[PDB]
TrEMBL record, chains A, B:
Cellular component annotations (GO), alphabetically ordered: membrane
Record protein name field: Receptor protein-tyrosine kinase
Taxonomy, superkingdom: Eukaryota
Biological-process GO terms, alphabetical: ERBB signaling pathway; regulation of cell population proliferation; regulation of signal transduction
Species annotation: Drosophila melanogaster
Name of the gene encoding the protein in the UniProt record: Egfr
Main location: membrane
UniProt keyword terms in alphabetical order: ATP-binding, Developmental protein, Glycoprotein, Kinase, Membrane, Nucleotide-binding, Phosphoprotein, Receptor, Signal, Transferase, Transmembrane, Transmembrane helix, Tyrosine-protein kinase
Annotated compartments: Membrane
Gene Ontology MF terms: ATP binding; transmembrane receptor protein tyrosine kinase activity
Family recorded in the similarity comment: Belongs to the protein kinase superfamily. Tyr protein kinase family. EGF receptor subfamily.
């Protein structure tokens, strides 16, 4: 089977709860065959952790980083290809690494099926117990490298021989762990490339990546160019063919989209469709339609980059943004005065505390492509009416924990007030530990969530009974879907009648009372003061 | 140099004035190197006509048809390639021809530089004097054929030998006319393809079309695939490159558009830009922006195909059309009752005369991509107010005569009344022989014409003095650009003040009189009856 993971880019971050970190890693990689990004295998103190969530990973597009891993036996039993499209280093001066194993206590690291590292280097740095790596002939695997990089200091067990049957080095004990060869055992005429046997003629294709199962093209393990239901192509079958006689772009029933070095019938949901390609953002002159990048009309909607943490120093950059291309994180430090730390742990600028009032800058925001994360605490930070015009959170990017698209945790909020929020396209709702927050438990989140597989974790906010005793419940004019707050304009869906954007029992409860259907009103024209449509009761002028 | 002609598709039509036909042919092909379409060389009765307008034609994409040509010597001195993307036949059962010479009295037909007919056959049919064609070894030229097709009946001069120096056949006298060979004299290893010399190894490229000047690719005479400032490519450099790491379509500074088998920096004006291709129409879901096919918004503008001649039977198909993709021809037969004739001259359906009133169907038309041609006569057909909302004639297709985009000839019109017409994008204005038509001579046509090279032929309508004596002149509120008719809403540009779409001396001449600039008014809000902006004179209500 084939299944896609989004990789991570946390580099050397230390998780607080190492147990949730485990859960996160597990939830992320289980049954995944293909990592879009970097596989970061980090901080697993227990020696006997079961890492079988790694069991189906076949290819990684970025780098593999193994840091602070003390599980005795760490095996990647099906990993074949590390592409190294993005690489890892401790610093600017260090080598760029596709495989980096560092500060880990594992006794073995087994990748018996590993074939090829397409780009970057292999490094081992201060792993006290790791065995066999020097028996591995690395120029067999590393495409642009001689050997692995080793480093040991700070003060070394004797180490077992490879299995009887190995012709050369191994990744560990038993015959399954003997290094195989598909590049060094080949003859020339192969000009250094891979092959499925010793003799000439049988040198894979040229397009092949990681080697091959037979003669050519349809027989590759993976591809140096585009990969298409099994065959390597120089390009994906375009979505339309140009007929040079007729001057027509005829649509192609076998056309496909380029997603990375992959040809695909539809772009994965975390990317948009631009021409024949799956892309991360629309270009400057385009906008997002139905998941498709398309020329605009008037001015294009003012769209702004997200920031990694909101604070006094960067909040004004969202002035007039309609769409935010990225995430929004409002944290404690947002309010208390955010402090730049740099890698070398040299203190950067520090910004003044943020006055929640300034959050009003978001009132023009209609879309967030990433996620929205709220964690801060402030006396005057009591709701999300700042986002009263936000109508969709795409979640094309999710949080490290629980695949969250909306996470509200340990905040000082009393109500949401996000009256326009209609879709959370992807990912989950986490709303926990907000000591004064009501409403969230009576909101039917699946209503606004697009998929059934999307999840809801909403608890340990304000106890149901203690909201009810303050009247901080829904207006009796909301249906059972709940509300963002006590307002009549705060319902998800309306029980009786909806008018103007507010919610009424009658439709007759007001001067103008023209009914448009089962549930709806509308104003009685400029001229009527009272009507039901051309004609009415208490008239006006011209 | 390089210059592009649009070819014709008139097949065997007989022109009335054979002298204007000559002029037309001349104006069409002079200095052209490349025919986009068919070269139709027809009906040239005089024996001593100078056909030097053919002198630079290098390649034709469609077919060459020579019919009723009695010029003694007809030479194509630089023609190299007939592609035969579209072919000619007298009927369904006949062969499909890329070169067809028929019912012509020429003594010779000289194409000394002809190399290759890429597709279709070569035919000679009832040419009484034509010489040398049987000496030409045709399998040298015809890619998918044995020999030329001959036919002679209806009742043959003796014919001169080729020049002393010819190794084989010729197109006529003198050493310049000896057939050259670049396909038959080649060895194999060439597998039947062309070459620049006898020995193996030197077999052109494979992409080459018509042969080659040296070894390979950059050395082709022309291309079987795309042609790019001189080199044959399997595809044009795309306009954006997809970066598979970053998931971005990066724009390509060396990208180009596909125009036929041609790569080009910009689409010729008779085509639009759709993705990387130059196209004839936008697809169903797109529309025309700045010469670019682009997704729509609301419903796409209702756009309808043109018809070859307007008449009672097809007029309703334009119900609600906003854009007409094609031409509009209103002819005498439109009004008198149009009669279908078929090739075999069997009478088709006949439609009832057309009541000009029905022309009102065009009132929604804002754009005509082709040309607009008006020739009919009817007592009640007195102006073009039917087209009162037409704002641009693109002229992406022009008339056979004078490159006309707007032609009004021998019509019963008194005035135009096309108050919204702002652009004739391409081609010319011909307005001649309308016995009762005024205005047209005082309209500054260059105002609405986009290019300076565009031309104006406006004469022999109603004599200037005889319009003036009926008051059928411009309102004294138009500037010197003239008008479409006597209305105040009929000026091209306004002298004093423009308001609502009509034209006034004062701006004060009316109840509401708020001035927005040097020349403009606007209504005084719902509430004022008299103002100048918030405040005014004779007020109203709420
Ligand atoms: C601690 O860490 C930070 C960054 O990790 C250091 O600040 C950075 O200093 C570097 C030089 O190492 C700056 O690079 C320079 O960039 C400019 C403009 O792009 C260029 O003209 C120079 O040639 C140079 O390459 C960089 O801008 C700056 N970055 C940041 C984010 O401040 C800092 O100096 C380190 N502190 C200590 C005590 O070592
Ligand atoms: C949802 O949150 C919004 C934004 O915080 C709340 O509206 C704000 O309510 C506060 C507290 O009552 C207002 O503070 C006052 O401002 C006035 C003049 O602006 C000042 O003179 C007072 O002494 C006081 O500081 C604030 O103005 C008001 N902001 C806006 C933009 O309306 C709203 O109360 C929240 N909804 C609920 C149910 O809490
Ligand atoms: C005179 O000329 C016209 C056309 O040039 C002839 O009318 C055409 O008759 C043909 C058969 O020769 C029709 O083709 C048929 O088309 C249908 C549907 O597409 C198909 O099912 C049949 O197998 C057949 O191929 C064609 O529709 C029709 N075209 C038009 C425009 O009327 C006409 O019959 C000729 N008259 C004489 C006296 O020979
Ligand atoms: C521009 O051409 C339009 C369209 O032909 C002219 O408007 C038309 O004027 C004619 C002749 O006066 C009108 O005919 C009359 O129609 C009425 C009722 O519709 C009928 O009862 C009369 O006995 C007579 O047949 C016609 O209605 C009118 N059409 C429209 C759509 O307004 C207009 O006169 C032309 N402008 C100039 C300066 O000629």
């Amino acid at each position: 089977h084939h299944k896609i993971c989004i990789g991570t880019k946390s580099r050397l971050s230390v998780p607080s709860n190492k147990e949730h970190h485990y859960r996160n890693l597990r939830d992320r990689y289980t049954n995944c065959t293909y990592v879009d990004g970097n596989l970061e295998l980090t901080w697993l103190p227990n020696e006997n952790l079961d890492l079988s969530f790694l069991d189906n990973i076949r290819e990684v597009t970025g780098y593999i980083l193994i840091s602070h891993v003390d599980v005795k036996k760490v095996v990647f039993p099906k990993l074949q290809i590390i592409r190294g499209r993005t690489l890892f280093s401790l610093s600017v001066e260090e080598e760029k690494y596709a495989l980096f194993v560092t500060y880990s206590k594992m006794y073995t690291l087994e990748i018996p099926d590993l074939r090829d590292v397409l780009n970057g280097q292999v490094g081992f740095h201060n792993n006290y117990n790791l065995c066999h790596m020097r028996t591995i002939q690395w120029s067999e695997i590393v495409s642009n490298g001689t050997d692995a990089y080793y480093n040991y200091d700070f003060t070394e067990r004797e180490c077992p021989k490879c299995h009887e049957s190995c012709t050369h080095g191994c990744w560990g004990e038993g015959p399954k762990n003997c290094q195989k060869f598909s590049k060094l055992t080949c003859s020339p005429q192969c000009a250094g490339g891979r092959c499925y046997g010793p003799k000439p003629r049988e040198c894979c294709h040229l397009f092949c990546a990681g080697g091959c199962t037979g003669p050519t093209q349809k027989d590759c393990i993976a591809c140096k160019n585009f990969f298409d239901e099994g065959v390597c192509k120089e390009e994906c079958p375009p979505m339309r063919k140009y007929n040079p006689t007729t001057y027509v772009l005829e649509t192609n029933p076998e056309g496909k989209y380029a997603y990375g070095a992959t040809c695909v019938k539809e772009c994965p949901g975390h990317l948009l469709r631009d021409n024949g390609a799956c892309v991360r953002s629309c270009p400057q002159d385009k906008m997002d339609k139905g998941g498709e990048c398309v020329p605009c009309n008037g001015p294009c909607p003012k769209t702004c980059p997200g920031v990694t943490v909101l604070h006094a120093g960067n909040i004004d950059s969202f002035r007039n943004c309609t769409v935010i291309d990225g995430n929004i994180r409002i944290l404690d430090q947002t309010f208390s005065g955010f402090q730049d730390v740099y890698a070398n742990y040299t203190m950067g600028p520090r910004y003044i505390p943020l006055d929640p009032e300034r959050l009003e800058v978001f009132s023009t925001v209609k879309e967030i492509t990433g996620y929205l994360n709220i964690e801060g605490t402030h006396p005057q930070f009591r709701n999300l009416s700042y986002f009263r015009n936000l109508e969709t959170i795409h979640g094309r990017q999710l949080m490290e924990s629980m695949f969250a698209a909306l996470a509200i945790v340990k905040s000082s909020l009393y109500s949401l007030e996000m009256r326009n929020l209609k879709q959370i396209s992807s990912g989950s709702v986490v709303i926990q530990h907000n000591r004064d927050l009501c409403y969230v438990s009576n909101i039917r989140w699946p209503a606004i969530q697009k998929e059934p597989e999307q999840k809801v974790w909403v608890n340990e906010n304000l106890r149901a009974d203690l909201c009810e005793k303050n009247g901080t419940i829904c207006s009796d004019q909301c249906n059972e879907d709940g509300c963002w707050g006590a307002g009549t304009d705060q319902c998800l869906n309306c029980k009786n009648f909806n008018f103007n954007g507010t919610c009424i029992a009658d439709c007759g409860y007001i001067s103008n009372a023209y009914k448009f259907d089962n549930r709806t009103c509308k104003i009685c024209h400029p001229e009527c003061r009272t009507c039901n449509g051309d004609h009415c009761q208490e008239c006006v002028h011209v």
